[PDB]
Amino acid sequence: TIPHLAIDPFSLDFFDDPYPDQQTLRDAGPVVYLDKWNVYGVARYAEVHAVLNDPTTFCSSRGVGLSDFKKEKPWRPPSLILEADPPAHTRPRAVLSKVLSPATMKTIRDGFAAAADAKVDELLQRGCIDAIADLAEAYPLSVFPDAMGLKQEGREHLLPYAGLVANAFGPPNELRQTAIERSAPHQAYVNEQCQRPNLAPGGFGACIHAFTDTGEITPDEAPLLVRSLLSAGLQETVNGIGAAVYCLARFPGELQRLRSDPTLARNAFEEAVRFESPVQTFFRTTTREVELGGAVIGEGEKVLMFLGSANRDPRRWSDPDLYDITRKTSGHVGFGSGVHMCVGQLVARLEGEVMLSALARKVAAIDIDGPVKRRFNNTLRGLESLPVKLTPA
Numbered sequence: 001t002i003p004h005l006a007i008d009p010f011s012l013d014f015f016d017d018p019y020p021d022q023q024t025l026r027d028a029g030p031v032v033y034l035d036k037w038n039v040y041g042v043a044r045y046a047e048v049h050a051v052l053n054d055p056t057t058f059c060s061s062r063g064v065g066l067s068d069f070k071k072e073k074p075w076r077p078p079s080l081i082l083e084a085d086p087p088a089h090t091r092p093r094a095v096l097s098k099v100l101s102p103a104t105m106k107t108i109r110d111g112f113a114a115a116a117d118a119k120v121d122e123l124l125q126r127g128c129i130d131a132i133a134d135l136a137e138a139y140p141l142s143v144f145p146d147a148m149g150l151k152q153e154g155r156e157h158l159l160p161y162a163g164l165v166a167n168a169f170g171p172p173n174e175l176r177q178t179a180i181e182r183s184a185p186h187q188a189y190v191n192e193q194c195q196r197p198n199l200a201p202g203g204f205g206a207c208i209h210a211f212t213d214t215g216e217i218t219p220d221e222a223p224l225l226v227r228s229l230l231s232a233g234l235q236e237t238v239n240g241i242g243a244a245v246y247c248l249a250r251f252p253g254e255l256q257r258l259r260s261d262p263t264l265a266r267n268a269f270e271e272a273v274r275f276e277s278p279v280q281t282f283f284r285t286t287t288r289e290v291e292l293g294g295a296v297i298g299e300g301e302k303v304l305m306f307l308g309s310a311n312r313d314p315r316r317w318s319d320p321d322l323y324d325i326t327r328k329t330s331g332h333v334g335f336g337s338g339v340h341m342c343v344g345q346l347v348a349r350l351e352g353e354v355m356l357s358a359l360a361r362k363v364a365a366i367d368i369d370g371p372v373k374r375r376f377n378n379t380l381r382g383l384e385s386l387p388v389k390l391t392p393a
């Protein structure tokens, strides 16, 4: 009944151009079986959205990677939020939500915007830049570690650790094996940065430890929570910003619309998140036998959600492969959906907005003038190098 496909969604060939294979997965049926890894797959928006919003049946506590924690040991202690189900998920989720709250954005918005403006002014003095290293990477590195309260030393560990964590959600392929092999120095920096004496007062990390007397998290749970904010977000935001710059360069009519109305910057970044979906995939594990798209999925089965494919499903989006900064982006699953929907989404949107805002007000043209290189990761899609020439406004 269920179609069996041999597509490996974690192969380098798939990463190099996922979009044709994503259509094949969608059109094969609402639910597919991936013989390569013995997991079910859902690639349409309807089934992806439904799975994400049923956390009891499609749980996260048995891991959101390929590995089933009931069968294998997690490669690191489980995240108290990403790899937890309600009700254990609820109160730690509440703390991170309040730590990355609307009122917190109000405190950091001015500095994030001023740093974004200064960075763009700096790159314009140079003209020809790498939009990844010099912009998409440089800006989030210039604001997010400081907002976290991290020391100045050791920040070179942040992006390698983030990519390690992301690769480890994948199947036991070479990308995952080589990741976990290299984890040793990075996890030790992360170790020490999650401890309260090591986080600057006022930052995200200190605010997590200050929440340890409310009854929502204990003091011994705070280091793992700080780890969450060191294991997620930075690379995605970098990838999402680099995606927006790339799209503004390839869809030049959209930059002209952005220049003429800079208040489109927030939706311009949201549409970049939908268009590229920095987080391509996540797994769930069925806790019971369940019917999904006329399919019967047994207990203890891994279900692979193609978020990027759901964000390009023509059953849900008009012209899904086009970057449109005035598209109604509401409902895209680039940040997930339901109880686990990205708790850091306001931080990512703020960083993305003020960068695209600085570009909208200061840049006239963005022209690719060099070879574009892609970075491969079991979970994340993003560019490694994007040589562009920035023309000032």
Ligand code: HEM
Pocket: 060, 064, 081, 082, 083, 093, 096, 100, 228, 229, 232, 233, 234, 236, 237, 240, 273, 277, 278, 279, 282, 307, 333, 334, 335, 336, 337, 339, 340, 341, 342, 343, 344, 345, 347, 348
């Ligand atoms: C473009 C930027 C980002 C993208 C595309 C993204 C993607 C996602 C997705 C899809 C999820 C859902 C995981 C699931 O349902 O299993 C998630 C959760 C999460 N994200 Fe983000 N994220 C981004 C930025 C950030 C930032 C900036 C932070 C931290 C400051 C962050 C921290 C987290 C955490 C801690 C979770 C776990 C939430 C939970 O399990 O309840 N992410 N992210």
Ligand SMILES: CSc1ccc(C(=O)O)cc1
Pocket: 079, 080, 081, 082, 083, 165, 166, 227, 228, 229, 231, 232, 233, 279, 379
């Ligand atoms: C790449 S999405 C993500 C990764 C790690 C965590 C965590 O460590 O809790 C949460 C979300």
